[PDB]
Amino acid sequence: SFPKYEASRLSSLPTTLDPAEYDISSETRKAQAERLAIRSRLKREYQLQYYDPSRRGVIEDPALVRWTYARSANIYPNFRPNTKTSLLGALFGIGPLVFWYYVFKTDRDRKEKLIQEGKLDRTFNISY
Amino acid sequence: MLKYIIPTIMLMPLTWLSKNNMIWVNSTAHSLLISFTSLLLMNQFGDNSLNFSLLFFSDSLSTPLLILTMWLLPLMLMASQHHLSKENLTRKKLFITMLISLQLFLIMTFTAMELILFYILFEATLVPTLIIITRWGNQTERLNAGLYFLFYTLAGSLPLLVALIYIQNTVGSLNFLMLQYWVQPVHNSWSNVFMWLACMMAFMVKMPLYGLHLWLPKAHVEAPIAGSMVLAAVLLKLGGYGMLRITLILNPMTDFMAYPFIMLSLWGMIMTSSICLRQTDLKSLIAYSSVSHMALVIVAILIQTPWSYMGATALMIAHGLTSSMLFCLANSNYERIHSRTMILARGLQTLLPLMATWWLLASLTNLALPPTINLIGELFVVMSTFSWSNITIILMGVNMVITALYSLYMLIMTQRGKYTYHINNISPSFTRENALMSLHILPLLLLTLNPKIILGPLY
Amino acid sequence: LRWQEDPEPEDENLYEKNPDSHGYDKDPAVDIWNMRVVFFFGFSIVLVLGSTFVAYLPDYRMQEWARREAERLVKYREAHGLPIMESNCFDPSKIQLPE
Amino acid sequence: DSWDKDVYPEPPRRTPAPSPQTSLPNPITYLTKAFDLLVDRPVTLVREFIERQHAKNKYYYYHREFRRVPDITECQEKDVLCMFEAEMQWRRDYKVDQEIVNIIQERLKACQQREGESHRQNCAKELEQFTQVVKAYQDRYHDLGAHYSARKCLAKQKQRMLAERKAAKEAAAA
Amino acid sequence: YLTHQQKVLRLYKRALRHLESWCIHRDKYRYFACLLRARFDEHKNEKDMVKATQLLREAEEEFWHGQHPQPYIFPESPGGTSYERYECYKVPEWCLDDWHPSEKAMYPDYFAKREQWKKLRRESWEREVKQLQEETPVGGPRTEALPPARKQGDLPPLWWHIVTRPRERPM
Amino acid sequence: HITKDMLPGPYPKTPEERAAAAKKYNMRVEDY
Amino acid sequence: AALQAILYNRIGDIGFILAMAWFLTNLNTWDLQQIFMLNPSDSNMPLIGLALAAT
Amino acid sequence: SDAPPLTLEGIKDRVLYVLKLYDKIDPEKLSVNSHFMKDLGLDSLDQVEIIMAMEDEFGFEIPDIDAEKLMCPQEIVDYIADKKDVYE
Amino acid sequence: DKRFLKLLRFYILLTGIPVAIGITLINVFIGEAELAEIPEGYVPEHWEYFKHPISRWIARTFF
Amino acid sequence: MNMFSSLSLVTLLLLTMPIMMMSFNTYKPSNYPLYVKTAISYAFITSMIPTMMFIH
Amino acid sequence: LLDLIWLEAILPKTISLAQMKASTLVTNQKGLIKLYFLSFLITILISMILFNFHE
Ligand SMILES: C[C@H](CCC(=O)O)[C@H]1CC[C@H]2[C@@H]3[C@H](O)C[C@@H]4C[C@H](O)CC[C@]4(C)[C@H]3C[C@H](O)[C@]12C
Ligand SMILES: [Zn+2]
């Protein structure tokens, strides 16, 4: 009796239970060899100028430039006003504003009427 | 007000006629003397403002802003000494000339008694501001930032010019002393709904208001050190200051025309504050923080109550001495590693022990830690808005929680943690950098002893 | 190449040529004096004398005067058995209401 | 010599006499003597030295008194030289009336502490005065907004008077 | 990757530490320590790929269902209480170039020998660069392992950041 | 120094663009 | 852990700001001496604010 | 931290001590360069338990990637000396 | 970092000590003023409505 | 009351003395831990006199 | 979405885009004397007929 472990985006599937990690062929093994190839090709480019004694500065990291350039300055050029963007924009953008306008219009109007009729307790309210 | 205009002009003859290795020493010395003499404007009385002549007056709203404006010119000269070391002598002189011109227009903007003179000088602080950003920036995006900055302001200022001229013809004058005793209620009609927007829109783009705020993340990020400090300390308060004066001739229509603007600001705080948590650029994070704090200022002015106007002044002065410090602290890192990304240079509390203390004080003030003047300003606004509507506590409270997350998060990411291994040029902090932060934080804490001098005219 | 452009100049560490540098200028004679004016006028003249000047300002916005004034009125008001504070700011004998 | 006793009332003191009933010593009595000898006595000597210095050079600061002037109700419309006189005076009354309320709030707050657990009953006189001056203040200096002016205050009074004199007709004409 | 031979060993070591948590006591723990070892010996000799993998794959399912929710973690291991407790004192060695002469004259011997190490590093650099170029394949390194020095007068390539690392207890 | 070609950009459509992008980000055409 | 404590304390401080606002508006004071003397009868809101802060 | 400083001599004595108490290794034919596979006849499972015994002796884990690569008491002594920074 | 603090302390106290010394001497030997009723037919100068000697100096010399 | 007031305030100020001395560098290093501990002790005794006057 | 896309989409980007399009229509002329003067005729006929500028 070993109930299945059901994962989610907040509970990753353990590497020791993933089926793909127990069925291994030559073609699958080849990929791991080349993933480690790039993983080792970049290491030396870093370690050739990391260990240099005639260096006083920062090591430019293109992997970081691409990450931050994509996060800020490459969103609009890749935006199509489709239906997903349109509906979400209206719901997220203008949706909250409409909600709060009527929540405060109703309250103030209700609070206005009570003071008009003089049935609101304001005995000691002299700071506003 | 001629005792502060002529000396500020005389800096330019001093700057150009000085020796070639004393332009920074002379300019910094006599700017501080002008700042020292600025204290004479605290002669305010409880009933009548101080009226020097037909052109200039200084009540309690402008005295805190004049002193802050004149106290930054000495600091912006210190901050610019480094990245202008490898610069031609003549261009360095022109750079100082632009800074002195900006101070001259600002000291006159906050003192002008006529609203037309206010508009001319309120608009004249765009030429020197635009030239500093575009000429002496660093990124290619600086040119596109100057365009957004110029046209956002002018797209709203031109309608204002048509309202002030109209008001003079239909009232008789724009002198602010007269308008107190000659103002008449604004009848509710479609014609006046557009007079109201004309008078207010020109000042809600410089605050800035949420929605009309895309020029701030570009101007305050691509601008040099001197431009950013003045931009987020002295040029955002022009809109807030202008509204405090222009809403004198907009009652009772201000009661029902402020709903679309309060809601934008109340929900603009949460939105912009949330955007801080997920920023990769350290300068940008400090740029969005300004929008969040100024949204309290806009709501404070609209609700038109004594407790909002008092806190509104405090939030403007306190924010100026906090944002300016944060930019200077963020720039100290940028003058060593040469990359604005926040996650690149981590663990700096093990290499720069004293500089990790200024971050803390600046960060502590940003999150409104009592009893600093940031808290007094924010507390008062949170009291006035509660009377306006009880439910406002839900929105105002959420901002305080989020504001603590991104202020301390910035502290943790850059300072705490494990230092970067391949960053091997983190030189010890200079005296110049340390003196720059001290002049930001020491004034910001002494005011807590005597806060009455930053609470505006209602006090 | 696409043009004859100078190579990016390496950063200069100001602590090398002048280990006692204050960070202001590359000329040791200039650097010391720049620090002195920043420290002297900035701190001694503005943040010490300035703090004293603000502390000892004459009564600011006559806040104190209103205190003595009120004490006089409260004494007078209670001595003669009048209300401490009226509910009308302007005497309702100089007002002519509509109709 | 000190603050006027009429503005800030203080009930008469009632100090119980000591009633020891044990042979053990009283640490408070001894510590009081030590305090009066190693602390209180030196302080008095220095103050008397400082007090005598002020006697050599004595001078006065006077209380500013404002001659009263016509109020806004006596000012023609758009006559700034008269509205200015009436508005500035009205403001000095706004500042003073605030202090009048503050002095009452000290009295109320003082009584509660002095009365200890019996504050509900023995401070009713102070509380009643507070409920009055607050009502008066709220009538003449409330809901005027941030741009308060004599004109708006007069408008509020002329509005309340209309309701007061209007509502009376229906009630009084029974 | 992890060969099937390596997987069991990791599953054995990790199956003992967790089993140690439940038992706590030495007497009880040793009793079931032997029993666990037997279950690995009763099938170790089999050399069938399908049967071998299935048992290992099936054993992990049992392991997951029985893992202690709060396994013992060493004080300075990943996730432990003292992990990284002393990262705030490991100052990089290059910080000593920025010292003032006043605070270098207090340690004349250490800064005299440091020059010896500094002089050595400059002399041994060009040799290390050359050594890697020839032995590096045409494409590039295909594994993460440096070659040792291959003659007198040389130091192993890329040695400065493995030799001069901060001590585990700087202060 | 980062050149234009070594930055993110528009969504690829053709397999050569996918293969070219996988080299830009230092990955493999099978994982990118 | 350090940031977590700030986050939870700040959430509670919403109740603390709520109570100050209510006392100032409905009693015109922050001192405890005056709050006790005026002894509000409708006090579900200010006291729930303190209860939130206490949590 | 107010604890005795490990020494190259001290570590070597304790590595051999644990092995000499293991009831699968003849004490007399155990030396400082005794391979556990050939020179002593122990499979890979036994080497896993030997590592666990050593770390319990010193109270600091050795990773799996490195643990399998130690098959000699000298290697154990050197590895511990490298983690604790022993130079004498 | 230490050198910066020494300069800040030195200059804060460069004028701090005389100001602390000067303020004390004024209070001990010149003291405050006393409140008096305005004599009949007398118009006090505008710097004769404040208490502290230092404040009356600001009123007379600057404001 | 004369003594009750003075001894209640001196408890608070005494605790701020170590901070003030350390700020302007008016202390001796290597002894601060024993300095701050001693200040608490004398602050504990000074707090008792107000307490005893309350009990009585 | 609400800061880098839509608030950019509505006011700044679309207003600028319209100006670029209009500038093309006004400046995409062919430099013909024949085509310019033929338009002057249309303006006068429009003025006299549609708007009555002749009166
Ligand atoms: C009294 C206390 C411990 C005495 C003891 O346990 O033997 C000692 C330890 C270090 C001392 C302090 C340091 O010597 C630094 C200061 C030097 C002077 O004694 C004045 C106070 C001063 C701050 C001292 C007060 C006190 O005497 C201290 C605090
Ligand atoms: Zn640099």
Structural class of chain I: mainly alpha
What's the story with the biggest beta sheet of chain F? none
Which shape of chain I, going by the Cα principal axes?
A: elongated
Largest sheet of chain I: none
Distance between the termini of chain F: 24 Å
- Percent range for helical residues of chain I? 55-70%
Structure annotation, total helices of chain F: 1
Q: H/E order of the elements of chain I?
A: HEH
Structural class of chain F: mainly alpha
- Sum up the overall morphology of chain F in one term: globular
- N-to-C CA distance of chain I: 42 Å
Helical proportion of chain F, percent range: 25-40%
- What amount of the residues of chain I lies in strands? under 5%
Which assembly state applies to the chains in this document? Answer: part of a larger assembly
Task: Work out the helix count of chain I.
Answer: 2
Bound molecules: cholic acid, zinc ion
What integer value in Å does the Rg of chain I equal? 18 Å
Name the chain pair whose interface involves the most residues. Answer: B-C, 43 and 39 residues
Order of SSEs of chain F: H
Query: Which band does the percent of strand residues of chain F land in?
Result: under 5%
Rounded to the nearest angstrom, the radius of gyration of chain F is: 9 Å
Main location (chain D): mitochondrion
InterPro entries (chain D): NADH_UbQ_OxRdtase_su10 (IPR019377), NDUFB10 (IPR039993)
Keywords (chain D): Electron transport, Membrane, Mitochondrion, Mitochondrion inner membrane, Phosphoprotein, Respiratory chain, Transport
Organism (chain D): Bos taurus (Bovine)
Structural description of this entry:
The PDB classes it as membrane protein. Keywords: Complex I, metabolism, membrane protein. Inward-facing, open1 proteoliposome complex I at 3.3 A, after deactivation treatment. Initially purified in LMNG. Chain A: NADH dehydrogenase [ubiquinone] 1 beta subcomplex subunit 4. This is part of a larger assembly, with eleven protein chains of nine kinds. Chain A has 128 residues and is mostly helical. Chain A has helices spanning 26-50, 62-72, 83-117. Chain A is built from three helices and no strands. Chain A is elongated, with a radius of gyration of 31 Å. In chain B, strands 1-2 form a two-stranded antiparallel sheet. Chain F is 31% helix and 0% strand. Chain F has one helix and no strands. The longest helix of chain F is centred in the middle third of the chain and has 10 residues, at 15-24. Chains D and I meet through helix 2 and strand 1 of D and helix 1 and strand 1 of I. Strand 1 of chain D pairs parallel with strand 1 (34-36) of chain I. Cholic acid binds at residues 27-28, 31, 34-35, 38 of chain J. Residues 27-28, 31, 34-35, 38 of chain J line the site of cholic acid.
Protein traits:
11 chains, B: mainly alpha, two-stranded antiparallel ribbon, 1% strand, I: 63 residues, mainly alpha, elongated, binds zinc ion, translocase (chain B), electron transport (chain B), NADH-ubiquinone oxidoreductase chain 4 (chain B), mitochondrion inner membrane (chain B), formylation (chain B)
